[PDB]
Design an enzyme around this catalytic site. Structure first.
Site, mmCIF file in Angstrom:
data_model
loop_
_atom_site.group_PDB
_atom_site.id
_atom_site.type_symbol
_atom_site.label_atom_id
_atom_site.label_comp_id
_atom_site.label_asym_id
_atom_site.label_seq_id
_atom_site.Cartn_x
_atom_site.Cartn_y
_atom_site.Cartn_z
ATOM 1 N N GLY A 1 44.998 35.399 36.364
ATOM 2 C CA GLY A 1 44.144 36.249 37.195
ATOM 3 C C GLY A 1 43.119 35.419 37.934
ATOM 4 O O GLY A 1 43.105 34.155 37.846
ATOM 5 N N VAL B 1 43.108 33.961 32.246
ATOM 6 C CA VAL B 1 44.438 34.448 31.810
ATOM 7 C C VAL B 1 44.357 35.956 31.558
ATOM 8 O O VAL B 1 43.389 36.483 31.032
ATOM 9 C CB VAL B 1 44.925 33.682 30.573
ATOM 10 C CG1 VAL B 1 43.945 33.812 29.423
ATOM 11 C CG2 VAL B 1 46.328 34.117 30.131
ATOM 12 N N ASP C 1 36.485 43.230 46.333
ATOM 13 C CA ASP C 1 37.687 42.379 46.382
ATOM 14 C C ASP C 1 38.955 43.198 46.181
ATOM 15 O O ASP C 1 39.864 42.750 45.429
ATOM 16 C CB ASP C 1 37.601 41.171 45.442
ATOM 17 C CG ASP C 1 38.642 40.098 45.802
ATOM 18 O OD1 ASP C 1 39.169 40.070 46.984
ATOM 19 O OD2 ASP C 1 38.939 39.285 44.947
ATOM 20 N N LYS D 1 42.629 44.552 46.743
ATOM 21 C CA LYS D 1 43.871 43.926 47.203
ATOM 22 C C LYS D 1 45.015 44.624 46.489
ATOM 23 O O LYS D 1 44.806 45.188 45.399
ATOM 24 C CB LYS D 1 43.909 42.416 47.005
ATOM 25 C CG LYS D 1 43.701 42.021 45.580
ATOM 26 C CD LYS D 1 43.372 40.534 45.456
ATOM 27 C CE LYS D 1 42.267 40.233 44.515
ATOM 28 N NZ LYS D 1 41.876 38.841 44.751
#
Length: 291
Positions: free
Chosen positions: A13, A17, A120, A122
């Site tokens: 990520g 992890v 952020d 996405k």
């Protein structure tokens, strides 16, 4: 490992992890996110355990033990990035795009009403289940750790969904940054192609400029005093949204245009977007998921 069994590495990520794991006390399967390296971040992230909504991935625990930080989330089997990639040859059906956008707006409206931004958004942090739900992952964090240039494994963090005010160096964020990202994601679901796939800050910015026109004081009062604005930026004309997102209908194109206004103050709110005529016929279809 004291408190759960770490089934697999889900992936790598932005901050550390990601594991699939089983809670030893309850037996529940969860996503465990290790955050690699601060007291201010712990209080902030802990407050998110109360920011509960059906279209927000549930934050089950913020485990700070052995001077390490783990976030424990509800587990969902698919993300929108992988779903869009698996849908490339046919596209996501329009009723399902509409359902997903409606639900994402509900999640935004809830978080924004509590004065929490994502910053952020996405496709990789939009998670989907077999019941036709979609949920936002990682809300409120961007306010805790920042958004790095590279991940902990040197992967480049994508710029494709970043609002123009951020690219122009505004040091202050508003709820509008999340509407911009969601508009970019809407366009990508419809066209099967990222809207603005920039590979540097200036390439990102210039891709926006080539589609929407180079912004000026008429459409964006204050833009020319932005930290990273330069008077030497090329002057591109604006493209019709009929050319950008065919075959989206006039209601969808109208809503998209309002999500992608340059001036964050002009951009539609999540709450006003829910009332848009594009959603008059919204439904909740069952998606074709292979797991």
């Amino acid at each position: 490992m004291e408190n759960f069994q770490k089934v697999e590495k889900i992936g790598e990520g932005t901050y550390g992890v990601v594991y699939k794991a089983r809670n030893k006390l309850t037996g529940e399967v969860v996503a465990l996110k290790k955050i690699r390296l601060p007291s201010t971040a712990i209080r902030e992230i802990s407050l998110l355990k109360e920011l509960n909504h059906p279209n927000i991935v549930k934050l089950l625990d913020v485990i700070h033990t052995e001077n390490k930080l783990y976030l424990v989330f509800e587990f969902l089997h698919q993300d929108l990035k992988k779903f869009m990639d698996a849908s490339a040859l046919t596209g996501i059906p329009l009723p399902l795009i509409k359902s997903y956008l409606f639900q994402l707006l509900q999640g935004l409206a809830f978080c924004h009403s509590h004065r929490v931004l994502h910053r952020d958004l996405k496709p990789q942090n939009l998670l989907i289940n077999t019941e036709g739900a979609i949920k936002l992952a990682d809300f409120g964090l961007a306010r805790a750790f920042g958004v790095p240039v590279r991940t902990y494994t040197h992967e480049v963090v994508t710029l494709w969904y970043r609002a123009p005010e951020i690219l122009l160096g505004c040091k202050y964020y508003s709820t509008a940054v999340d509407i911009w990202s969601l508009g970019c994601i809407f366009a990508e679901m419809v066209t099967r192609r990222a809207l603005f796939p920039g590979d540097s800050e200036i390439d990102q910015l210039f891709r926006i400029f080539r589609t929407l026109g180079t912004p000026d004081e008429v459409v964006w009062p204050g833009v020319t005093s932005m930290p990273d604005y330069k008077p030497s930026f090329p002057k591109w004309a604006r493209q019709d949204f009929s050319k950008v997102v065919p075959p989206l209908d006039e209601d969808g194109r109208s809503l998209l245009s309002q999500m992608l206004h340059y001036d964050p103050n002009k951009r539609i709110s999540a709450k006003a977007a829910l009332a848009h005529p594009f959603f008059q016929d919204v439904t909740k279809p069952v998606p074709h998921l292979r797991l």
